[PDB]
Design a protein around this ligand. Structure first.
Ligand SMILES: *[C@H](C)[C@H]1/C(=C/c2[nH]c(/C=C3N=C(/C=C4\NC(=O)C(CC)=C4C)C(C)=C\3CCC(=O)O)c(CCC(=O)O)c2C)NC(=O)[C@@H]1C
Ligand SMILES: *[C@H](C)[C@H]1/C(=C/c2[nH]c(/C=C3N=C(/C=C4\NC(=O)C(CC)=C4C)C(C)=C\3CCC(=O)O)c(CCC(=O)O)c2C)NC(=O)[C@@H]1C
Lengths: 314, 314
C-alpha cells in the first residue's frame, strides 16, 4: 500500500508547484492544482495541453524544451525561469521518467536572481570546505566521523537539530551522533523500531538522496493528470512530494515541523542504505535547491568515509 | 619599470569591459574605452559621472548598489547583470581598491542565462570531485600528486596543455608535470631562467591567484579615469588586466595564444609562491568566472597537499 501511493506521488507540498511534460510534444500532461496561481495571472489557462511558451519567457521556455534532449544523469539543475506575464522567478528542478519530463518549481526572491551563480558557488564552497575537514579527520573512529558530519551539516543548513541515524541489521535505527541548538531534548543513543521508517521509504532513499519537508502542517496540493493516460504517472522523484499522513503526524507529534533528510548509501554507483543524516526544525524551514545539491555531495563523501571506517573495523 | 606598468598600467583585454565606481556616490569614475559599445546601444550614455541606474536593469543595479556596502572578503561573485532595455547579460566580478569599487564585466550568451546557477554548481562539483581524488592519494610522492593535479586541471579547463611549474630556491622554474592533447610537443622537464617571470609578477600571484589571457594577439583597450580623481586607479586586481607587451610577445613566440595560470601558495593566509599551474591553448580560449573560481579552490587544496609533501620528505 505504501509504495503504490508514494510512487504515484499525487500530493505535493504547497511551497512549490509541479508540471509534467510529454517529451514528444513538450505540452503539459500533469500539473499541481496550485500551478495556475503560481505560474500565471489567471487568454488561455494552464491545463492539460498547455504549451510552455505561453507560461514562461522565451529563454526560459527554451531552456526547459532543450532539457528534453539530455539523459537524466546529464541534466544540470536547477534552471532559473521567469514567468511570462508576471516575470516572477522560480528554480525549475528537472527529472525524467521515461517519456515524461517532470519539473518542480520553487520560488526565488527577486534579489536572489542576480546572485544565483554567486549563491550557488558559495553553497558548494562551504560544502567543499566541510569535505576537506571530513578528510582531515584521523581514521579509526566512526563516532568522531559522524560527530564531525552532523556538526558540518548543522552549520551548513541552519536546522535546529541534526542527527546521524544508523540502520542496524534488523532494519531498526539508532541515533549515533547529534547536535542541537541549546535547550532541545536529545535523542542521541536512542533506538527506534524498523517500522518507523518503512521499507518503501528506505527504498526511495536509494534513488532520491535528499528529501525536504518545509512544514508538516501545510495543506497538500493535488496533482491532476491527462485523463487520456491509462496509467498513473510516477511523481515520487519530485522535490515537492508530500509526506504520507502517518509521517506528517509523527513529525507534528515530536515538534519537528520541518525536516531535511540525506541518504547515506555505502558502495554507491554491496550497495546499501547505511543510514540517514536527519535535520529537523521546530518551525517551518525552506532551503533552496543549490544548497540541497551541495548537501547531496557532502553526503556522498561522508558515505565513502563511513564505508572506509566499516572496513577498517572489519 | 615592471611594477609601474603593472600597478599603473591602464590597459585591459577586449573580451570584457570595466567600470570603476566611487565608493560613496556609486557613480562612474573610470571606464574602459569599449564599455560604451559593450554596455549601451549608443551627453553620452556612458562616461565619467554616469549613474549605474541608467545602465542596468533594477535587480542588476540594486545588486551592485548593495555590493558598494560589503567588505571585499564578504563579496560573493559573480553578479549576473543585465543592461537596460536590451537585457544584454554579463557576469560582474567586483573587487575593491582604496577609493573605488571596480567591476569587471564578462559577457554571457543570452540563452545561457537560465543555466547560470546550474553551470556554477557543475563547475564546483567537478572541482570538488577532483579535490577528493587529490585527497585519496597515498602520500609520499610529489610526482604522483603533481601528475594528478595537472590531469584534473586539464579535464576541468579544456586547455591544450597543462603544466606544473615549480620555483627553485634561486627563483628559476622547472616544468615538473605536464599533460597535453595528443600530438603536442612536450615541455616536461625544462628549466627556465628566473627572469622569465619577474618578481613583480611573482608577487602579484600572491594576491591575484588566477590569471586568464584569452588571446595574446588581441588589441588592448585603455581605461580612462577622471584626471581629478584624487588617486590613481590600479588594475592589478582586474580579471581583464592586459598582459605586458613583453609577455604577449613571449606567448605568441611559443604558440600559447591563450593561458590560464593558477598560483600555488604554500602556508597561505613561511608563505611562499611554490609554483604555478600553467594552462596554455594554441587558439584563443575563454572560460567563465565560476570555473575560474572553482579552480582557485582546487589550487588552494593542491597547495596544502604540496606543503604536506614537503614537510614529509624533510
Ligand atoms: C505509519 C502507520 C507508520 C510510519 C510511516 C512512515 N514513516 C516514514 C518515514 C520516516 N520516518 C522517520 C522516522 C524518524 N525520524 C526521526 O527523526 C526519528 C528519530 C527521532 C525517527 C525514527 C524518518 C526519518 C522518515 C523519512 C521521512 C522523510 O522522508 O523525511 C514514511 C515515508 C513518508 C514519506 O512520505 O516519505 C512512512 C509512510 N511511521 C510511523 O511512526 C508509523 C508506525
Ligand atoms: C620582458 C622583457 C621579459 C618578461 C616579462 C614578463 N613575463 C611575465 C609573465 C609570465 N611569464 C611566464 C613564463 C612562462 N610561461 C610558461 O608557460 C613557461 C614554461 C613554458 C614560462 C617560463 C609566465 C607563466 C607568466 C605569468 C603570466 C600570466 O599572468 O599569465 C610578465 C607579467 C605579464 C603580466 O602582464 O602580468 C612580464 C612583464 N618575460 C620574458 O621572457 C622577458 C625576458
Amino acid at each position: 500500500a505504501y509504495l503504490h501511493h508514494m510512487q504515484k506521488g499525487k500530493m505535493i507540498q504547497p511551497f512549490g508547484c509541479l508540471l509534467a511534460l510529454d517529451e514528444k510534444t513538450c505540452k503539459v500532461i500533469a500539473y499541481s492544482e496550485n500551478a495556475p496561481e503560481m505560474l500565471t495571472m489567471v487568454h488561455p489557462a494552464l491545463g492539460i495541453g498547455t504549451d510552455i511558451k505561453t507560461l514562461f519567457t522565451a529563454p526560459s521556455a527554451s531552456a526547459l524544451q532543450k532539457a528534453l534532449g539530455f539523459a537524466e544523469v546529464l541534466l544540470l539543475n536547477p534552471v532559473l525561469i521567469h514567468c511570462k506575464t508576471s516575470g516572477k522567478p522560480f528554480y525549475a528542478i528537472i527529472h525524467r521518467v521515461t517519456g515524461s519530463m517532470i519539473i518542480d518549481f520553487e520560488p526565488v526572491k527577486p534579489y536572489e536572481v542576480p546572485m544565483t551563480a554567486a549563491g550557488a558557488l558559495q553553497s558548494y564552497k562551504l560544502a567543499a570546505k566541510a569535505i576537506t575537514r571530513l578528510q582531515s579527520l584521523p581514521s579509526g573512529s566512526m563516532e568522531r566521523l559522524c560527530d564531525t558530519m552532523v556538526q558540518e551539516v548543522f552549520e551548513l543548513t541552519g536546522y535546529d537539530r541534526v542527527m546521524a541515524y544508523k540502520f542496524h541489521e534488523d532494519d531498526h535505527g539508532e541515533v549515533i551522533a547529534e547536535i542541537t541548538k541549546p535547550g532541545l531534548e536529545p535523542y542521541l543513543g536512542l533506538h527506534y523500531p524498523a517500522t518507523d521508517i518503512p521499507q518503501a521509504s528506505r527504498f526511495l532513499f536509494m534513488k532520491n538522496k535528499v528529501r525536504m519537508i518545509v512544514d508538516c502542517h501545510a495543506k497538500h496540493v493535488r496533482v491532476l493528470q491527462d485523463e487520456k493516460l491509462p496509467f498513473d504517472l510516477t511523481l515520487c522523484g519530485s522535490t515537492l512530494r508530500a509526506p504520507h499522513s502517518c509521517h506528517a503526524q509523527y513529525m507534528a507529534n515530536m515538534d519537528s515541523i520541518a525536516s531535511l533528510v540525506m541518504a547515506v548509501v555505502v558502495n554507491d554507483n554491496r550497495k546499501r542504505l547505511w543510514g540517514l543524516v536527519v535535520c529537523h526544525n521546530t518551525t517551518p524551514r525552506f532551503v533552496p535547491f543549490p544548497l540541497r545539491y551541495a548537501c547531496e555531495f557532502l553526503a556522498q563523501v561522508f558515505a565513502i568515509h563511513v564505508n572506509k571506517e566499516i572496513e577498517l573495523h572489519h
